């Protein structure tokens, strides 16, 4: 099954800086980028990073080798740009990540053109 | 090589292209990683410890067009069955490449019984356990080819039997010999044949103000399976009064007959020749 | 009407044609009943008592070709919400007809946001409870049309909001004015336009051995949205010495000028005229 | 879910003339016609009839208005010819059938070109 996550400042789940989702193996996490149809400058755009607890706590990435997906298409014709992460135990692709049972994984944001008012982050925990 | 005409290109579709999976849902899955600071997509399957695996990934219906021989360029990664520290009994390190011809798109109505096995695709570089931490991508390239194709279109299929595969690219194309201008002759774009030795003899048409000399071989070219124009026979030469195109001689210069030679000056009195309005035998000093 | 060029025909596919359903599996379903001793298939949905229904049936990708205005012929049945003796609160008696243009087939990657509403299709004959036992089929016919189409191809979609519908036919076609021979002139096959009043003026080319007389209007035809050739202007007539085609006059018969008139006999001495090898003014009795 | 039924004399489930399948609402019954790739005359072909208990017991149909599907394509290119019956409570098509809870439905065969050695029939019961 799948867990929908609308990654935007207007989501109240991000306001306490402790947004946490609980998943089971072989499940998908659908991170929905901001989407519009509004001022072209006011359109939120983020860089999603799959990181470690240190990068999560400090809300700052250590390297570009952590960049997961780009929310660079806010007024996309087709629909909202998404990042669909299968929480699979095994991957045939090395640059991708394997999700072990009983572990926590962290996602962090960085505004592409806007100012960082608050820290946008999510914690995914495998049951 | 010659000119390639691309009929399908998965990595160019920007994730927007959706391929049917059978059984529905289960099996292959679309992934979204980042490679060389570029967003990329891929079809993955890794049901190595389940068993009785028969997971089909079928591309969409591809309009054959004029194509006789299609070329299939696959870029994939395959993980070794000993890379699983748990131990996978029903594990495989291959997948089978299939194709099917049809005059109609069946859409969701997929039937394995209609697919012909092209080959058993094996990795040349197998993903070992140490590769993940090393962030080393072992990207395998396999080119296969099918011919002659005859129906309105085809599908390509990737059937998995319980392996750990990540398919990053599927690019189907056919070759053509390009529209050529050679030996003052025009040779049209010609579809390359299906049979490996075969060479289609293509007749040439002389360019504007060029002619095939009497006795001289008529301009001809041979089109090869790779799209190359091979073995030129004959040529065209600029007609009387003309000298890469055929243009008339500058005043006071002439050309009597069609030849390789350019327009010579006019001693001592257009153009095919220079008038004296005496000589008995019209290119000689009159 | 003129000539129809069929781009899609569900009832002709013999069940072999599979259309994507969204959400996957749920919603519309393929059925196999017998009608007039003939095997038939259909797409049905009847989630009348569930609620929050948004069931999409999307046809496969249709190559537009040269088509400017497509015609959509639907044959379906719809059941009344009072025909359920249980009572259906979230019940509807309509479905919405959508379309989408694309230069690429997205296959399984269906996105509602890309579809434009053609119309709210309603039954003209609603299925009441007494109809089942009576074995009466109330088969509704609805023709809709979209133009101008411009991209490489399109999809048609049937979105259901919680009704009891059975779709037996979906036939998409475009019209053309056929290759015509009229007034001793040839008019090529012309694609009918998209705009309802529009009439494309098509120039004619005179048949073998026919000419447009001096002063006389040049042969022209007008192609209508339905594929009809309307309002003939001008014509061709058989040239001097010729008399539905232009054939030379039989010996001893002649034709001086191009006209409607046939070849007249030769008193008293091919052909454009008859030689006397006297007359001062060559069609007069010499 | 779906129940596979290979309708052929070689199926031992038909030999006691009491083949019975138990279904739940909204489920499919997949009746798989005989399929080959054998002598063109020896290829079994049947007329499937959805009938009443009287027609079931006697194994004989009362009218053509009972004919369900034809197994007339035994050497079919695509694969075996099938008849997929959704055991749905409601139908938008009048010539089709509605399947009520707690009822029994009966299917009977008739060889198209061959001889009727035994009676081929199936009973479907809704839970």
mmCIF file of N, CA and C in Angstrom, chain B residues 11 30 33 58 73 75 79 138 141-143 201 232 235 266-267 280 286:
data_model
loop_
_atom_site.group_PDB
_atom_site.id
_atom_site.type_symbol
_atom_site.label_atom_id
_atom_site.label_comp_id
_atom_site.label_asym_id
_atom_site.label_seq_id
_atom_site.Cartn_x
_atom_site.Cartn_y
_atom_site.Cartn_z
ATOM 1 N N UNK B 11 14.374 6.078 -21.868
ATOM 2 C CA UNK B 11 15.076 7.118 -21.110
ATOM 3 C C UNK B 11 14.781 8.544 -21.590
ATOM 4 N N UNK B 30 8.421 0.982 -11.411
ATOM 5 C CA UNK B 30 9.145 2.175 -11.859
ATOM 6 C C UNK B 30 9.860 2.824 -10.680
ATOM 7 N N UNK B 33 15.680 7.279 -9.357
ATOM 8 C CA UNK B 33 16.911 7.705 -8.723
ATOM 9 C C UNK B 33 17.554 8.887 -9.479
ATOM 10 N N UNK B 58 5.953 -5.386 -20.441
ATOM 11 C CA UNK B 58 5.734 -5.257 -21.876
ATOM 12 C C UNK B 58 5.721 -3.817 -22.270
ATOM 13 N N UNK B 73 18.481 -1.676 -28.102
ATOM 14 C CA UNK B 73 19.571 -1.308 -27.190
ATOM 15 C C UNK B 73 19.063 -1.214 -25.761
ATOM 16 N N UNK B 75 20.021 -1.156 -21.592
ATOM 17 C CA UNK B 75 21.003 -0.769 -20.563
ATOM 18 C C UNK B 75 20.394 -1.162 -19.223
ATOM 19 N N UNK B 79 21.922 -8.164 -10.249
ATOM 20 C CA UNK B 79 22.547 -8.496 -8.969
ATOM 21 C C UNK B 79 22.731 -9.997 -8.779
ATOM 22 N N UNK B 138 27.243 -0.905 -12.059
ATOM 23 C CA UNK B 138 27.683 -1.833 -13.104
ATOM 24 C C UNK B 138 26.635 -1.863 -14.229
ATOM 25 N N UNK B 141 25.285 -3.320 -21.180
ATOM 26 C CA UNK B 141 24.774 -2.952 -22.507
ATOM 27 C C UNK B 141 24.626 -4.206 -23.370
ATOM 28 N N UNK B 142 23.407 -4.453 -23.840
ATOM 29 C CA UNK B 142 23.160 -5.605 -24.696
ATOM 30 C C UNK B 142 22.365 -5.202 -25.924
ATOM 31 N N UNK B 143 22.952 -5.362 -27.124
ATOM 32 C CA UNK B 143 22.221 -5.091 -28.342
ATOM 33 C C UNK B 143 21.772 -6.383 -29.003
ATOM 34 N N UNK B 201 20.658 -2.053 -54.549
ATOM 35 C CA UNK B 201 21.204 -1.224 -55.624
ATOM 36 C C UNK B 201 20.268 -0.063 -55.852
ATOM 37 N N UNK B 232 30.432 2.870 -55.029
ATOM 38 C CA UNK B 232 29.865 3.753 -56.066
ATOM 39 C C UNK B 232 30.145 3.244 -57.482
ATOM 40 N N UNK B 235 28.697 7.726 -62.624
ATOM 41 C CA UNK B 235 28.643 9.125 -62.183
ATOM 42 C C UNK B 235 28.000 9.987 -63.261
ATOM 43 N N UNK B 266 38.913 31.326 -74.038
ATOM 44 C CA UNK B 266 38.604 31.394 -75.466
ATOM 45 C C UNK B 266 39.568 32.074 -76.440
ATOM 46 N N UNK B 267 40.737 31.464 -76.760
ATOM 47 C CA UNK B 267 41.586 32.052 -77.810
ATOM 48 C C UNK B 267 41.059 31.601 -79.186
ATOM 49 N N UNK B 280 38.759 24.170 -89.842
ATOM 50 C CA UNK B 280 38.062 23.033 -90.472
ATOM 51 C C UNK B 280 37.596 21.924 -89.519
ATOM 52 N N UNK B 286 40.395 28.603 -83.575
ATOM 53 C CA UNK B 286 39.802 29.160 -84.790
ATOM 54 C C UNK B 286 40.256 30.602 -84.985
#
